[PDB]
Structures are given as C-alpha cells and as structure tokens.
A = this chain, B = another copy of it.
Amino acid sequence: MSQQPGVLPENMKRYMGRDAQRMNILAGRIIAETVRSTLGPKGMDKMLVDDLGDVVVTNDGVTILREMSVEHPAAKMLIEVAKTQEKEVGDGTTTAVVVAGELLRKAEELLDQNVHPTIVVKGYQAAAQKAQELLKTIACEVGAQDKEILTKIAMTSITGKGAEKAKEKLAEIIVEAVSAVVDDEGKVDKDLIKIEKKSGASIDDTELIKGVLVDKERVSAQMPKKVTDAKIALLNCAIEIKETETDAEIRITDPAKLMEFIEQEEKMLKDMVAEIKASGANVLFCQKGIDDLAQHYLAKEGIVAARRVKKSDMEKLAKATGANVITNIKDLSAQDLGDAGLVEERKISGDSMIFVEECKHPKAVTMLIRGTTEHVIEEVARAVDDAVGVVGCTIEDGRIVSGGGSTEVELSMKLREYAEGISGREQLAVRAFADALEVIPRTLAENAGLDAIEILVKVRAAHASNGNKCAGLNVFTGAVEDMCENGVVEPLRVKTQAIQSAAESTEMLLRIDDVIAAEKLRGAPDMGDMGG
C-alpha cells in the first residue's frame, strides 16, 4: 500500500516490457489488496474522501471501482473484470474478484522463468468446467432442500454486512420479493421494488409500502392535502390546446369583437374536463398536466391538480396497473382499473406524502419506507435491494447446491485431486491454482484466533463424504454443522460467473509481458513520452 496514487510518476507511458508484467501484477495486486481489506464477509468500513463529496460503502465493488480513476494502464483494464461480473449484480462478486486476483501471484511466479502461460489458461478454464460440475450439488448437507424463506433470511443475514438489524429485516423486504418472483421477467421485477427508504420522521422499524407508492409529489396545490378517498382515477397526463399548435402565420386579423373568441377557448377545455369527470374517477396524475383554467374546473371536479415531468412514475403506474396504454388527446372511456380510492396520508416527515390505495393484486407494486435517515440508510437501503434482486435472478431453476461455509475449500480439494491426471503441462498450475482456491476461502476467514490455517486443518476434518459448512467469525468459532447460516448463498449461483470472470481476465492480464507501451495520444491532452 505504498506508491500513493500509482506513485504519480511515469507520466504518459514508455519503456521495455518484461519488467512491466511484474508491474501490471504490482498494480493489480495493490488495488486488489486495498479492496480485500474488509470486503465481502470482512466487509466493514473503507473510508472515502475527494474534493467536496461523500461515498461511504461496504461490500460493494462497483463503488470502489467508481473511483481511483486510472493509476496505471493496468488498474483500469481490470476494473472491467469486476464490471463484467457486476452485470447480474451482487456483492459476493468483488470478493471473488479478490480470489481471482490472488493466485495469479503463485501463477506469475509459478514455473519461474517460463514463457508459456498457455498451460495456465488450460487450467483456469478446466477449473470452470469443474465449476459447472460443482454447480450440481456437492454440498450434500443442505443440498438444495430447505425452505426458500430460509435462503431469503440468508440474504438478510448478509444484507450489506453493515446491516442495522443483524437479523430479521428479512421477510419484510422478502414478501415484496415473493411478489417480485411472480413477475419473474428478469428485470421488471427489480424495477418495481425500485426507489427508496427513509423519507420519514426519525428512524426505527417500518417497511413494505404494500401495493403502491407509484408517485412522488404532494400533488399540485389546490387541496391534495385534503380529500381522502379521492378515488380510482388514472389519468396520466392531461395537456391543453393552449391555442397552440398554430403558429398560423397570420391569425385574428380584424379588431373589436373578440369578446367571443376569448370566452369560447376557455369553454373548449371546460367541456373536455367535464367529460373526463363523467368517469367519476377524479384523481389526476400528470407530467405535462397544467390546465390552469379547466383545472379550477378540475379542482371542483377531481379533488386536486398536479403538474410536472416524472415519467418513471408512469411506468411505475403501468405497475400501479391502471390500464394506461392509450392516453392521447381525447375521449377514452373503457379503462380505469387502478386499485381503490383511499389516497395520500398527509404531511408526515416533510415535502411530499404519496402512496395510493389498495384493491388487491400481488405484483407491479412499490417498495420504500421511513426505515432510517439518508446517509446511515443509503447504504442499508441499497444493500438490502441487492439482497432482494440477486436472489430474484437465481431463485429460478437450473441450480441446486449449498454455498459458502467453505463448500469451496474442498470443492478445491477435488481440483487438487484431479491433479492426479498427470498432464496439463506437469506442474498442473490448474492444481497449483486449486491450492489458492483453497487458500482464499481462508483469506475470507479474516482472523478468529490470529492469522489462520489453524482452522483449515479443522475444515479438513469431516468432509471426505461429510460436507462443508458453518465456518463463522462471530465469537463462537464454528468448525462445521448447521444454522451458523452455513454459506448463506444458495442461490449458490454467482460462483458460476465468479469462477469464470477469473479464467478469462487473468489470462489476458498475463501473457502480456511485452512493451507495456509508449503510447501516442488517442485521448487528450498527450504528446511525446519522457524517458530516453
């Protein structure tokens, strides 16, 4: 952890390559170590700064990568490996970026003085083919059989580690996920749960926003503050014929008798607003909704009025589910299915209070509540969604296996065992790598007594056909056995990719022991290089 900000020298690149890979390793190793420090289950506090700003976080890889802009043409290159795994999000991903970013060390050294990494590549991919193999239950103990609600609590156990409730915030965020799982489109489900928490006086326990938040606004001023039970209406954008389309080129040539034309236009919108009231719906929602004159009419006929630009609310409204496919200009009578009539609990916390009525229908619902205040909540608020979203992707079929709890430590003994097959070169850097896949679940260990490997022999005991699980950090050092929350992950899948991102990136990260460049500008401002 020296050489502050990539030591800040070597301004715009040059020089020779065979010491540069060792340089690439140095650059990749340092950023991998700083992240490793309290990341994943270690997870806690990583302090941030900048010139006037804030980014407190824990267990998040995208956030750490959001930063340290460049510092060497090696750090940026491997930000993407985390980024590639970031697609199909999670937090256990970057912890896996650490496992990949580590063995490459015993691998870069490896056969010290050999130009052919071409052997090591055959190995990592082989470990991945073994990965698809271990995807099929290798755990045996938990297997896949357990209540799904269990796997749900498991994600709540991890949360974002820095979780306020070291326990059951669980099924709160989960029921909304249990609803979200019914949608199962792969993304529209994470779109409904989307948005907030907090926005309430004080802190404490609150959650769900049951069936519909869908809007953000105290709703424009007339009396949104009043009129409880406004009713079912679902007009999502009234616009007026403000005497504009026109531009005419020339219009209203003759003087005097304009006393009609002025009154008639206000009249034209008053009739269209009276007919919309005929629906007996009343509530108005609208981005471009200002119709001031026939708004006062709408005030009499439609509880209140609203005024501006939230489109995501309309898509969120498509989730409110009031059939709002067709809404252009005039006359549509058939659709109005959005919930019941009870609306807007007024003035708590501040600014705006908005959540719609509920006439039961499971999905396409929102998810946000008072919970806790902004900064302390920002982190617990998001991590729990990552908890609700990642589980949502894997909950579907195609997978069965207990994760974590060193299920990996011996998955790797199998990898070391396959080394029995004499040829993948000889060294079986595939196996030598396996050794690391065995050392990493231990890097996770963090501490317990002091350092480690004391507990590794402990894991070796009882797995021949027994199975791995339970290794924990809480005061009680759990060798193996039940409800230590094992490896919370089952959805164990993420390892499938956590294993792959390694083999692909780590290979082209190496074998690249040439030049390291003396690059001419493609970006700016650059020109010439200095060193020779």
The B-contacting residues of A in range 22-65, CB under 8 angstroms, are 24, 34, 37-38, 44-56
Minimal Cβ-Cβ distance residue in B for A203: B500
Across-interface contacts of A346 in B (CB, < 8 A): 185
The answer to whether A48 and B73 touch (CB under 8 A), given A87-B349, A164-B504, is yes
Q: Is residue A88 contacting chain B, with contact meaning CB distance below 8 A?
A: yes
| Binary contact readout A69-104 vs B (1 if CB under 8 angstroms, 0 otherwise) | 110010011001000100110000000000000000
Q: Is residue A508 contacting chain B, with contact meaning CB distance below 8 A?
A: yes
A84 and B512: CB pair below 8 A? no
The answer to whether A519 and B50 touch (CB under 8 A), given A373-B87, A374-B80, A376-B508, is yes
| Binary contact readout A485-506 vs B (1 if CB under 8 angstroms, 0 otherwise) | 0000000000011001000110
Q: Pick the residue among B45, B204, B261, B265 that contacts A514 (CB under 8 A).
A: B45
Most B CB contacts (10 A, CB to CB) among A50, A188, A512, A521 go to: A50
Q: Is residue A278 contacting chain B, with contact meaning CB distance below 8 A?
A: no
Q: Which of A170-178, A320-328, A358-366, A399-407 contacts B (4 or more CB under 8 A)?
A: A320-328
Q: Is residue A248 contacting chain B, with contact meaning CB distance below 8 A?
A: yes
Q: Pick the residue among B24, B252, B347 that contacts A187 (CB under 8 A).
A: B347
Q: Is residue A421 contacting chain B, with contact meaning CB distance below 8 A?
A: no
A241 and B255: CB pair below 8 A? no
Across-interface contacts of A162 in B (CB, < 8 A): 508
Q: Pick the residue among B251, B255, B262 that contacts A245 (CB under 8 A).
A: B262
Q: Pick the residue among B164, B300, B522 that contacts A55 (CB under 8 A).
A: B522
B376 and A84: CB pair below 8 A? yes
Give, as a whole number of angstroms, the nearest-CB distance from A95 to chain B: 16
Q: Is residue A253 contacting chain B, with contact meaning CB distance below 8 A?
A: yes
Across-interface contacts of A512 in B (CB, < 8 A): 44-47
A47 and B508: CB pair below 8 A? no
Give, as a whole number of angstroms, the nearest-CB distance from A197 to chain B: 14
The answer to whether A5 and B254 touch (CB under 8 A), given A447-B115, A519-B48, is no
Interface of A is mostly: loop
A203 and B256: CB pair below 8 A? no
B49 and A514: CB pair below 8 A? no
The answer to whether A513 and B53 touch (CB under 8 A), given A16-B1, A329-B293, is no
Bound Cα distance A467, B461 (Å)? 41
Bound Cα distance A49, B522 (Å)? 9
Across-interface contacts of A24 in B (CB, < 8 A): 47
Give, as a whole number of angstroms, the nearest-CB distance from A325 to chain B: 6
Q: Which of A146-154, A435-443, A524-532 contacts B (4 or more CB under 8 A)?
A: A524-532
Q: Pick the residue among B68, B259, B348 that contacts A520 (CB under 8 A).
A: B68
A325 and B299: CB pair below 8 A? yes
The answer to whether A13 and B49 touch (CB under 8 A), given A56-B508, A87-B201, A515-B34, is yes
B51 and A521: CB pair below 8 A? yes
Bound Cα distance A246, B254 (Å)? 12
The answer to whether A5 and B528 touch (CB under 8 A), given A45-B514, A49-B516, A52-B523, is yes
Across-interface contacts of A54 in B (CB, < 8 A): 73, 76-77
Bound Cα distance A296, B519 (Å)? 53
Give, as a whole number of angstroms, the nearest-CB distance from A32 to chain B: 14
Minimal Cβ-Cβ distance residue in B for A43: B511
The answer to whether A88 and B34 touch (CB under 8 A), given A51-B525, A513-B45, is no
Bound Cα distance A256, B243 (Å)? 11
Give, as a whole number of angstroms, the nearest-CB distance from A349 to chain B: 7
Across-interface contacts of A53 in B (CB, < 8 A): 522-523
Q: Is residue A375 contacting chain B, with contact meaning CB distance below 8 A?
A: yes
A350 and B261: CB pair below 8 A? no
Q: Is residue A15 contacting chain B, with contact meaning CB distance below 8 A?
A: yes
B254 and A241: CB pair below 8 A? no
Q: Is residue A280 contacting chain B, with contact meaning CB distance below 8 A?
A: no
The answer to whether A518 and B47 touch (CB under 8 A), given A80-B375, A328-B292, A523-B52, is no
Give, as a whole number of angstroms, the nearest-CB distance from A189 to chain B: 10
| Binary contact readout A253-274 vs B (1 if CB under 8 angstroms, 0 otherwise) | 1111011111011101000000
Across-interface contacts of A483 in B (CB, < 8 A): none
Minimal Cβ-Cβ distance residue in B for A17: B47
Bound Cα distance A49, B245 (Å)? 54
A255 and B256: CB pair below 8 A? no
A255 and B255: CB pair below 8 A? no
Q: Pick the residue among B3, B17, B44, B372 that contacts A504 (CB under 8 A).
A: B372
Bound Cα distance A100, B406 (Å)? 40
9 pairs, CB–CB < 8 Å, chain A vs chain B:
A5-B520, A45-B514, A47-B514, A48-B519, A56-B77, A255-B261, A293-B328, A293-B329, A447-B450
User: Other CB < 8 Å A-B pairs besides A53-B523, A87-B349, A299-B326, 13 of them?
Assistant: A1-B16, A4-B14, A49-B519, A50-B517, A50-B521, A51-B524, A80-B374, A84-B374, A185-B347, A203-B504, A256-B261, A447-B450, A449-B449
Closest 7 CB pairs of A and B: A51-B526, A45-B512, A248-B252, A52-B523, A4-B532, A49-B517, A249-B251
